[PDB]
From a paper:
Microbial rhodopsins (MRs) are transmembrane light-sensitive proteins, found in Archaea, Bacteria, Eukaryota, and also viruses. MRs are composed of seven transmembrane α-helices (A–G) with the cofactor retinal covalently bound to the lysine residue of helix G via the Schiff base (RSB). KR2 contains a characteristic for all known Na+-pumping rhodopsins (NaRs) set of N112, D116, Q123 residues in the helix C (NDQ motif).
Moreover, it was recently reported that in the ground state under physiological conditions (PDB ID: 6REW4) KR2 has a large water-filled cavity near the RSB (Schiff base cavity). Thus, we suggest that neutralization of D116 is the key determinant of the formation of the ‘compact’ conformation, which explains their structural similarity.
Residue numbers in the entry: 2 to 6, 8 to 270, 272 to 273
The structure:
């Protein structure tokens, strides 16, 4: 009965361990992640004057997301290198008992804080038509909170009870679907009052949103996408999961923010 290896990262680290390549690749991608959030923070601060006052709350929410993402992705990166240590005998990296072990806390806290602000910020750039600001905001905030909480409950059972990990994943996915449905309505209403140039940016925001947000549940399932005896049920699934989370983070926070800023500028021409 394995005791030291809470999450799939710790499990692999405690059993098979990590190759020099898997350990170094993961450390570099997590470092890239926090480095891009810091670059983003400076970009959103320095370009805030490029949009009319009425849109600047969006630029502010982008900057605030970047502060929390930078700090918590920095903490996640340090957590990776501190949790696994090289054994000369076998020549791999194993879970270090003298460490605090890999912790999903940093990532899930990041999501809890930033999901509501990413959903909120579009409501300061587009105008609704038949929907109420307060109704859309409340739906986004409730569904967003329940999605991340149900997901967090799931992640605990990942190694101890796979079945529960999936059922909680499914409940989380139900809230996710409601978020996609609301955002699609917001984007369609936002297109009504604006130039074709603005409508085209909103079409690109929808595709970026749909893809980047679906990467999260994809990374959540990554180790189990080739079955329990599968090639992903390994350090390869851990590498893939951390890579996909980093791509999702850069896309859902930084690229999303840039596109909204670009939309605000096109509304700052007609
Ligand atoms: C910058 C961080 C963002 C936008 C985080 C978004 C996270 C999700 C959309 C997560 C959704 C999940 C599911 C739909 C099912 C599995 C568990 C989650 C929480 C990963
Ligand atoms: C306006 C164009 C600004 C480009 C900013 C590029 C930053 C890339 C990160 C490297 C520091
Ligand atoms: C017209 C659109 C202008 C694009 C500017 C985008 C600037 C984003 C900079 C933040 C992320 C860059 C990555 C740097 C890594 C170091
Ligand atoms: C108008 C300001 C020019 C873009 C700032 C670029 C910041 C990227 C960080 C590196
Ligand atoms: C565009 C005016 C900005 C008002 C801020 C409302 C959001 C604050 C969240 C609490
Ligand atoms: C303005 C939207 C709310 C985001 C602030 C923090 C979110 C609460 C979770 C802690
Ligand atoms: C629903 C989201 C719950 C996330 C809370 C976890 C916070 C833990 C912070 C890092 C762990 C350090 C030990
Ligand atoms: C919604 C999930 C229902 C159960 C899936 C069956 C997987 C069990 C394998 C152990
Ligand atoms: C989409 C509705 C799904 C119903 C299940 C709700 C379960 C609540 C989760 C417990 C909260 C902690
Ligand atoms: C034409 C504008 C397209 C915006 C999406 C950019 C995303 C880069 C791909 C990663
Ligand atoms: C059409 C351009 C839309 C942006 C492309 C999607 C990027 C997904 C992130 C990975
Ligand atoms: C359905 C819209 C885009 C989905 C992108 C694919 C994400 C699933 C798993 C990612 C690895
Ligand atoms: C809501 C569930 C989305 C996860 C899709 C990712 C799986 C990729 C194909 C299997
Ligand atoms: C004409 C419209 C084009 C705007 C596209 C915006 C691109 C966002 C730039 C950030 C991409 C981050 C990639 C850095 C990783 C190295
Ligand atoms: Na180490």
């Amino acid at each position: 009965t394995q005791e030291l290896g809470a999450n799939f990262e710790n499990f692999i680290g405690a059993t098979e361990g990590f190759s020099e390549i898997a350990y170094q690749f993961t450390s570099h991608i997590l470092t890239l992640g926090y480095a891009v959030m810091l670059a983003g923070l400076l970009y959103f601060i320095l370009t805030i004057k490029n949009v009319d006052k009425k849109f600047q709350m969006s630029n502010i929410l982008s900057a605030v997301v970047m502060v929390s993402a930078f700090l918590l992705l920095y903490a996640q990166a340090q957590n990776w290198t501190s949790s696994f240590t090289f054994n000369e005998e076998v020549g791999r990296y194993f879970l270090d008992p003298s460490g605090d072990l890999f912790n999903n806390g940093y990532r899930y806290l990041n999501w809890l804080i930033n999901v509501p602000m990413l959903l909120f910020q579009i409501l300061f750039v587009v105008s609704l038509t038949t929907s109420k600001f307060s109704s859309v905001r409340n739906q986004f905030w409730f569904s967003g909170a329940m999605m991340i909480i149900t997901g967090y409950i799931g992640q605990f059972y990942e190694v101890s009870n796979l079945t529960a990990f999936l059922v909680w994943g499914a409940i989380s996915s139900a809230f996710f679907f409601h978020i996609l449905w609301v955002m699609k309505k917001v984007i369609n209403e936002g297109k009504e009052g604006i130039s074709p140039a603005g409508q085209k940016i909103l079409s690109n925001i929808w595709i970026l949103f749909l893809i980047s947000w679906t990467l999260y549940p994809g990374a959540y399932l990554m180790p189990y996408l080739t079955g329990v005896d599968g090639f992903l049920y390994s350090e390869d699934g851990v590498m893939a999961r951390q890579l996909v989370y980093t791509i999702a983070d850069v896309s859902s926070k930084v690229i999303y923010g840039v596109l909204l800023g670009n939309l605000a500028i096109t509304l700052s021409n007609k």
